[PDB]
Symmetry: C2
Subunit: 264 residues, 2 copies
């Protein structure tokens, strides 16, 4: 019931105390829809760099992971749920910057050049949201200390600054950098799943948060393993979309149709 009578009212500020906090309202209605036993066979891939931009993208991602796994100490001593949930908490904060700077920029360009965008913006904005929902889920499982909260604030100041300037100069580099990020994400989350299937990591967070259960249309019988499965699937999707987008830039197809709009 949204009509002229509501459009003509000045404010609905006086309605806020009678509207419920529902978990389905945290995202848009564009929710992934994975079937677990199919997404079980998401695999680990590597796209070959084309030339100098692509080598830059990959070396920067590899340099970043080696720094990150070494400083965060992920490597030595056994995997645990605490360092898994911890790691993801941190990285999912950065994770939703690229897609948002991307869609913001294609949006601004579409507005100033009065051109069509042909389905790109929506894909990058929903991507940004997806990653943000990754964050929302992990923060139901672990609430961070102050050091990690301060690190997250500064890490955003730098990556937003990096990504904004990187995307104005070379959208190709950004999409490719992201493609290569999600390659590592799919590796990490398949590490998580493998350590579970092998009993090396006995997960305890098996009451999947409500936020995630409605976001991924997961049953109440979904476990931690299933949550990591559907997150990893999301990551892989971003892996392809981004490498695809970068490729389109490489071929001067950046003003072409978003192929994923129809593959849908």
């Amino acid at each position: 019931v949204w009509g002229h009578t509501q459009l003509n009212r000045l404010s609905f500020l006086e309605t806020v105390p009678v509207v419920p906090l529902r978990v389905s309202d945290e995202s848009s209605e564009d929710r992934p829809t994975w079937s677990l036993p199919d997404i079980e066979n998401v695999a680990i891939t590597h796209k070959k760099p084309n030339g100098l931009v692509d080598t830059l993208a990959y070396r920067s991602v590899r340099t970043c992971r080696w720094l990150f796994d070494t400083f965060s100490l992920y490597r030595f001593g056994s995997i645990t749920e605490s360092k898994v949930i911890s790691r993801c908490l941190f990285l999912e904060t950065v994770a939703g910057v690229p897609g948002m700077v991307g869609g913001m920029l294609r949006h601004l360009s579409s507005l100033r050049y009065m051109t069509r965008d042909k389905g790109w913006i929506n894909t990058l904005l929903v991507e940004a949201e997806n990653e943000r929902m990754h964050l929302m889920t992990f923060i139901e499982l672990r609430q961070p200390g102050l050091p990690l909260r301060v690190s997250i604030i500064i890490t955003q100041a730098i990556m937003y600054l990096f990504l904004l300037v990187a995307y104005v100069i070379s959208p190709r580099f950004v999409h490719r950098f992201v493609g290569y990020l999600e390659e590592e994400a799919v590796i990490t989350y398949t590490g998580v799943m493998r350590a579970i299937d092998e009993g090396r990591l006995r997960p305890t967070k098996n009451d999947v948060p409500e936020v995630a259960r409605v976001y991924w249309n997961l049953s109440k019988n979904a476990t931690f393993r299933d949550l990591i499965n559907v997150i990893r699937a999301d990551e892989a999707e971003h892996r392809v979309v981004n490498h695809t987008f970068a490729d389109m830039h490489e071929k001067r197809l950046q003003n072409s149709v978003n192929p994923f709009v129809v593959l849908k």
Copy 2:
């Protein structure tokens, strides 16, 4: 058909030449849904400023309209379709900046503070899209000269800069400024409709563009008058949402639920 086999492919760049350019792909599937004879009675309103921020917002909007109508010469000599379509072309370029800076910023804040956003971001992003589709429609009707294309590029450089810094400092001012923008938008577009109903402006662009016909689920028998009706309705919706949002900031409800998520 989106599964592990597609998630595991590296790129779909080789599919782009076999995917059609459909007008429905230009937006997301979150389309307004107005009934013409109801939205016919959208009216002209004015929210009273609360205090200094609100007076600033309104005076800046009034100062901007008086400059704009005077320099653009909208005032003297009769209304025409050419100056109507022209005016809107220009203003709809700015029109979709606020909502995008808004959602980008609430998104970034949600990511760095690991907090819930409770349905706000999606509303501002879809708003930004809505205005952008206003732009897409008007550019089917009139293609601008170079002077206006150069003015649009510079006007974005300034408003994006203004709005970004304004929203970091006072989201309340921005939402309120926007509220007051849409007040004028609803006035302009009801001027358009009234000049039509009175024969002062005999519109010729009566083959509503395909982009708009699918975006607003308008029939092939929709005329120019109907297009302006549904644009004006959209504007009024933004008028309320924004004043509502500003009000929530005024009351320190900025971390509360987006009331519109449920009013839906």
